[PDB]
Design a protein around this ligand. Sequence first.
Ligand code: SF4
Length: 64
Amino acid sequence: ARKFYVDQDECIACESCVEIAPGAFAMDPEIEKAYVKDVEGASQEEVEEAMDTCPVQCIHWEDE
Ligand code: SF4
């Protein structure tokens, strides 16, 4: 159906998204950045709001 995720590649180090989704997004030591590991940790309204909170928006939904 509809998916999504991020590329901690363009993630500076702010928890802006992590807050709008302290369950799906969360920076790590391997990616020393926030990564959408748990898509269920953030609802579309939450995961989304957090995505709009990012400065560069290093996140992208995955349809396929
Ligand atoms: S909102 Fe954007 S810059 Fe801040 S941790 Fe999440 S991915 Fe990183």
